Amino acid sequence: MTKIKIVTDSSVTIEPELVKQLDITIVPLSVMIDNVVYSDADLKEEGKFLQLMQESKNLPKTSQPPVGVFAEIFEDLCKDGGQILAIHMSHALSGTVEAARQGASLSTADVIVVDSSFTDQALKFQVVEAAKLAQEGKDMEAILSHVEEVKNHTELYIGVSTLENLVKGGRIGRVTGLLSSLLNIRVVMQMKDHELQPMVKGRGTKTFKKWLDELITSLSERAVAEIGISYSGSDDWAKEMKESLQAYVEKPISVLETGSIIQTHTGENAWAILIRYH
Ligand SMILES: CCCCCCCC/C=C\CCCCCCCC(=O)O
Numbered sequence: 001m002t003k004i005k006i007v008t009d010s011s012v013t014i015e016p017e018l019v020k021q022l023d024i025t026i027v028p029l030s031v032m033i034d035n036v037v038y039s040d041a042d043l044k045e046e047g048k049f050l051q052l053m054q055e056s057k058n059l060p061k062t063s064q065p066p067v068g069v070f071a072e073i074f075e076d077l078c079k080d081g082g083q084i085l086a087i088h089m090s091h092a093l094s095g096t097v098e099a100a101r102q103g104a105s106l107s108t109a110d111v112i113v114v115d116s117s118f119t120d121q122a123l124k125f126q127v128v129e130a131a132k133l134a135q136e137g138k139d140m141e142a143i144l145s146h147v148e149e150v151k152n153h154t155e156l157y158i159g160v161s162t163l164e165n166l167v168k169g170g171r172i173g174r175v176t177g178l179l180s181s182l183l184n185i186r187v188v189m190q191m192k193d194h195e196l197q198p199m200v201k202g203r204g205t206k207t208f209k210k211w212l213d214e215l216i217t218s219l220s221e222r223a224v225a226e227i228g229i230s231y232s233g234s235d236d237w238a239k240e241m242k243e244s245l246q247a248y249v250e251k252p253i254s255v256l257e258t259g260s261i262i263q264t265h266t267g268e269n270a271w272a273i274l275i276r277y278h
Pocket residue numbers: 029061062063064093094095096119120158171191230231232258261262265266270271272
């Protein structure tokens with residue numbers, strides 16, 4: 001057969017050892033910082049991108065991987081005679097997945113391309129479950145079906161402390177019915193069917209804590225398989241959320257600094273709660 005090979009993009013937020021252990025291939029996005037282009041692959045060191053974005057003259061600008069890079073990576077991976085499954089961030093956030101579709105079509109490899117409908121650790125849940133099944137030698141049908149199951153049992157919540165990065169990066173366009181006369185405000189959103197749906201907005205310092213208490217109430221009678229927490233800036237608030245959420249899931253919670261691609265659009269002092277239910 002040769003086992004199926006899993007591909008994703010560098011919007012995935014994941015422990016780096018897990019990438020190697022499950023033979024996942026990560027296609028890097030890039031980001032321009034004061035007119036200098038960096039590969040996302042060189043911005044994974046804790047706090048490194050944060051510090052560049054804090055000091056850069058210009059707001060950074062993110063870029064999807066080229067069609068051609070996807071085609072070239074798919075060609076090298078299929079030399080073993082295997083199929084490829086590429087799982088990518090939402091088409092609503094990035095052209096990445098369309099680039100993978102074009103790349104697949106240009107390559108001679110047998111390549112299936114799936115839109116995760118998410119990013120960050122929610123994309124991680126799909127990718128990791130795909131790679132686990134791949135390495136057990138499951139076929140493409142079985143992998144796709146289980147990955148869909150993971151997706152359909154996943155929720156993504158995000159909190160931002162400013163809207164300026166979302167406005168300047170354009171992804172404010174995917175936020176449905178948010179009215180704010182202020183950019184410097186705290187907002188919690190749910191990413192649902194490729195839209196960012198606002199759940200609450202507030203200037204005050206308890207906006208996130210109050211929202212969290214409502215989340216925890218709702219988790220009373222859910223069976224939770226995994227919780228991941230991601231953050232930009234310092235991890236203080238993320239660690240506090242972990243303390244209250246860990247009681248609700250057996251598996252230890254991964255608390256991870258999000259990547260440069262997401263930090264560019266969220267700004268500092270953002271966070272995410274990624275939940276996969278049984
Ligand atoms: C703080 C961690 C947040 C994790 C959840 C992110 C949810 C989606 C919201 C904002 C990020 C948007 C990222 C857009 C990247 C585009 C890349 C490109 O094609 O240039």
